[PDB]
Point group: D4
Chain length 160, copies 8
C-alpha cells in the first residue's frame, strides 16, 4: 500500500492506544507510517515532520498525546494537511487534560478531535479512511464493508 497516513505519538507509552489506530488502517488497506515524535522533547523533529509531510506524499496525519497535549496542534500549525487528534488517557485526570489541550484550538488552526483513548484512536483511522475514500476506490470499498459488517454484527446478536 502507498504511504498516505502518518501516525505519530508523543512517547512510546502511547503505543498501547495508537496501535488500535494502526490496526484499523491495516485492515482497510491504508498505507501508513508510524513514528514517535515528541512535541516537548523533539520539537525540531516535530516541525520537520510536519513541514515535509505533504511533499512526502502523506494526505492525513493522526497525532496522539496526553496530559498537556500539544503535538496535534503544533503539527497542524506547520502543515496544511488535515490533522486528527487522539487524546490519550492520562493516568491522573483520565484524559480530560488531553481532550481540552487538543480540542480547544482557537480559530485559524484546526485539529479534528476524537474520543479519549482507544475509541478515538480507532475513530481517527476510520475518519482518515473517509477522507481518502473520495480519491481511492479500494479504500472506499473497504470502508463500506467495515460499516456493513459492524451493522451486521449487531443485527445478528440482538439478545444480550
Amino acid at each position: 500500500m502507498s504511504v498516505q497516513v502518518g501516525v505519530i505519538m508523543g512517547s512510546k507509552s502511547d503505543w498501547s492506544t495508537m496501535k488500535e489506530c494502526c490496526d484499523i488502517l491495516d485492515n482497510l488497506g491504508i498505507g501508513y507510517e508510524c513514528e514517535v515524535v515528541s512535541a516537548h522533547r523533539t520539537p525540531d523533529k516535530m516541525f520537520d515532520y510536519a513541514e515535509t509531510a505533504k511533499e512526502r506524499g502523506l494526505k492525513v496525519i493522526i497525532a496522539g498525546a496526553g496530559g498537556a497535549a500539544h503535538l496535534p496542534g503544533m503539527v497542524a500549525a506547520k502543515t496544511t494537511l488535515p490533522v486528527l487528534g487522539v487524546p490519550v488517557k492520562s493516568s491522573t485526570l483520565n484524559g480530560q487534560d488531553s481532550l481540552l489541550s487538543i480540542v480547544q484550538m482557537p480559530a485559524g488552526i484546526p485539529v479534528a478531535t476524537f474520543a479519549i483513548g482507544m475509541a478515538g484512536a480507532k475513530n481517527a483511522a476510520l475518519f482518515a479512511a473517509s477522507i481518502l475514500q473520495h480519491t481511492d476506490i479500494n479504500i472506499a470499498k473497504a470502508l463500506a464493508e467495515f460499516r456493513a459488517e459492524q451493522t451486521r454484527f449487531v443485527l445478528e446478536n440482538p439478545d444480550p
Copy 2:
C-alpha cells in the same frame, strides 16, 4: 456545493454563521440549513442518506446540550462529518462537547472547539480536505494562513 452546513435550530446561527463566512472567503460552495435531530428526525436521516449523491463532500453539523445531530448524521453517511459544539447557556458547552466527541469506536465525528472558534475551524478543516482536488481552494487557504500569520507579525508590541 461541496459542504453542507447544518444545525439543530436557528438559535445556533450566531455560532454557525462564522463557519459560513469562512467558506465564502475561501470560495467554497456550500448550503446551510436547520436540520433538527430531535424535531425533524426523518429529514435528518434523508439529508444524511442523500448528501453524497447530491455531491456533498463534507458535512459540518452544530448542536448544543445533548448534541446528537453530528453523531446521528455520521451514522447515516460515509462522508466525513465535522462536529461543532454550540455553547449551551447552562453548562458553557461542556455537555455539547462530550455529547459530540465521545463517539465510541465505529462511527467517527471530527470535533472542534466549543462555539465560534470550532465553527471557524470546521470551515477551515473542510478546506484542508477539499484542497487536495481543487487548486483555487489550495491557493485560498494558503493565503488565509499567510494573512493570519502576517497579521500577528505586523503587530508585535501590543502596547
Copy 3:
C-alpha cells in the same frame, strides 16, 4: 410485553440486566434487545416507530459515552422513554449522563442515575407508570418498597 428494554451494545448488559431483573420480580412483561443508534440507525427508527402498535407502554434505553440512543428513540415515539446512563471507562459516565439528560425543550428523556442504580430505578419508575392501570403491579411495587424499608429497619446496627 409492556416495557421495551434496549441498549446500544452487549457490553451494556452487565448494567441493563439489573433493570430486567426488577421487571421480572414485579411481574412486568418486557423484552430486552441490543439496538444501536450509531451502528443500526434504521433498526432503531423502526423499533421506536412500531413500539406503540406492538403493545409497549414504556421504553428503557441505556447507552454510554456519546449516548444518543434514548434521545433519538424519544424523537421517534410518543411513548415515555427512560434513559439509563451507562458507566463509561474513561469519564465514569459523566459523558453518558450529560448526553442523555440535557435534551432541549420539545422531546423529553426521563434520566436516572449513572450505572446500575439508574438501571434498577428505571425499572421501578416504569412500574410506577404502569401501576395506574393494573392492581397486581401496584401491589408488587408497594411490596418491593415495603421489603426495602423492612431490610433497613430490621438491620439498624452496622456493627
Copy 4:
C-alpha cells in the same frame, strides 16, 4: 381536573418552574403550583407527598437548586411518579442540583430532566406523555405540540432568513 402537582423549594424557582406550568396550560392539563420547601417546611413536604394520590394527583413535578432534596424526598413518600427539574443555581450553574436529583441510589427513582427552563418544559411534556394513555384530549394536545415543533423547522429551513 387537577392531575399534576408542580412544586418548588422557593419562589426564586418560579422563573424556571413557570415555564413548566405554561406548557401544562397550553396542553390543557390541570395542575396546581405550590411552594413546598424540603428544608424549611419538611412536615408540609411529607404531608403533600403522602396525600397526593388520594387528592387525585397522578404525577408530581418538583424543582429545586443547590443541594436539591425536594424531588427525592417527595419520591420517598409517594408511589406516584416524580419528575425532578434541576434549577440553575447562581454558583455552579445547576451542576450541584443535577447531581443532587439524578444520582438517586436504587430503590426510590426520580425522573430527571435538563438543568433550567429546558428541563421545566420537558418535565411538563413528559407528564403529558404519561397522562395521555388515559386522556384523549391530552394525547391530541401533545401530538399537536410535536407536529407544530416539527412544522416550524421544516418551514424555516434557511437560517439566513
Copy 5:
C-alpha cells in the same frame, strides 16, 4: 454518656463511618451508630432527628453518598448541629455526595467535611471540638490527640527513614 448520634444511609457506608466511631471511642466520647435511610426509611429518619435533643444527643454525624440527602433532611428536623460526611460514591468518587451535602441554601446548615474516611475522622474530631466546651475530659482528650499527631511528625522528619 451518649452525646453523639452517628447515622448513615446504608450498611455499605460502614467502612467509612466506622473510622468516625473509632475516633469517638479513642476520645472517650459516648455515641450510638445506626443505619437510617432518608429515602427508604424517611419516617424513622424524621423520628430520629425529632427526638435527638430530648434523648440527650448534642451532635449528629450523618454520612451518605450519591444524591446524599440524609445530612440535610436531619438538619431540617433538629436544632442540633449536624455534621455531614460525603461517602465516596463508586461512579463519581463522591463529587455527587459532596455537592448534595455542602450546597445547602441559607436557613438550614450542614457542616461538611472531606469526601470519604478523611471527612469521617474529621467529623468526629469536630464533634469533640463542640463538646469540649462543657466536657473537661473531652477537652483533655482532644488536646492530647492533637499533641500526639504533632509529635508523630516531629519524630519522623526524614522521609527516607526505613
Copy 6:
C-alpha cells in the same frame, strides 16, 4: 460579649461575609469581624488563632476564595471550632475555594458550608447551633429564626 470571630482574607470578601455578620446581629450574638490574610499577614493570622480561646471566642468563621487557606491554617492553630465559607471566585465560581477548604486531611477539621452568601448565612446559623447549648437566649433566637422561615413559606404557598 464577643463569642464569634468573623475573619476573611481580604476586604473584597465583605460583600459575602457581611451576610454572616448580619445574621449574627439578628440572633443577638456578639462578634468581631476582621480582615486577616493567610498569605499577606501570616503572623497576624497565627496570633489571632493562638489567642482566640484566651480572648473569649467560642467559634471562628473564616471566609476565603481561590486557593483558600485561611480556614484550614486557623484550625491548625486553635482547638476552637472553625467554620469555613468558600467565597465565590471570579474565575472558577468558587470550585477552587470549596475544594481548598473542605478537603482537609484527617487531623484538623474545618466545617465547610456552601459557596458564597448561602454558606456565609449558614456558618452564622451553625455558630448559633453551637452556642445555644450553653446560652438559653441564643437557643430561643435560633428557634424563632427557624419558626419565622418555616412560617414565611407556609404563609406564601402560591408563587405567582
Copy 7:
C-alpha cells in the same frame, strides 16, 4: 536592562498580561512584551525561544488561552525558566488554559500560576524572586512590595 520577556498568543491577551508588565515596572525590572502566537507564528515562536538567552533574557513569561501551547513550546526550546499564565477563556473560564499549561509530562517544566490576572501579577512577582539573587535593587523592591501589601492589611482590619 531587559531580563524578562513577556509574550502572549494574541493582542486580546493584553488585558490580562498588562498586569504582569505593570508589576515589573513597579519593581524596576526591565522587560519586553511581544505577541508570539504558537499556532499562527510557530517559526517566530521557535526563534524567540532560541535566541532569548543570548539576548540576555533570564526569564520568559508566556500567556495563552484555550488549547494553550505557547508556554510549553517555548520551554521546549530554551533552558531559561518559563512561567505560564493561563488566560481566562470565554467558554470554559480558563480550565482548558490551566490544564493545557500545567499538565506538562516529566522533562520540560512550566511554572504555572493562577487563571487570569491573579496569575499575571504573580508571574511577575515570581520572576522577581528568581532575579533577586542576582540584583540587590530587585531584591529590595520585592521586599518592599511585600512589606506594603502586608502593612495595607494590618492598617485596614475593619472591612465595613
Copy 8:
C-alpha cells in the same frame, strides 16, 4: 552545599517527592528532604520558611495533597521562590491538590507543576534552571539531561518491536 529544600506534608507523599530528589541527585544539586506538615506542625512550618534563606536555601519545593496549603503558606513566609507539587489524592485524582496550590491570589506566588510524579520531576528540573546561572556544572548537567531525553526519542522512532 544544600541549595534546595524539598518538603512535603506527610510521609504518604514520599512516593511522589522521591522522584524530585532523584533528579536533584542526578544533576549534582545539593538538597535536603523533610516532612513538614502545614496542618499538624504549623510552627515548624513557619520556622522552616523563616530560616530558609539564612540556612543557604535558594529554592523550596513543597508537595501536598487534598486541601494543599503547604506550598502557599511557605511562600507567604519566605522571599525565596517556592515550587508547588500537587500530590495525587485518592478521592479527586489531585484536582483538589492542583486548585489548592495554583489558584494563589495576587501578592504571593507559587510556581505550580503537574499533578503527581511528573510535577515532582519537573519541580526539580525547574529548580535547576533557576540555579544553572550559578554553577557551570549545574548548567552542563541540565543541558545533558535534556539531550539525553531527546536522544531517547530520536534514536527509538518506531514504537513497534
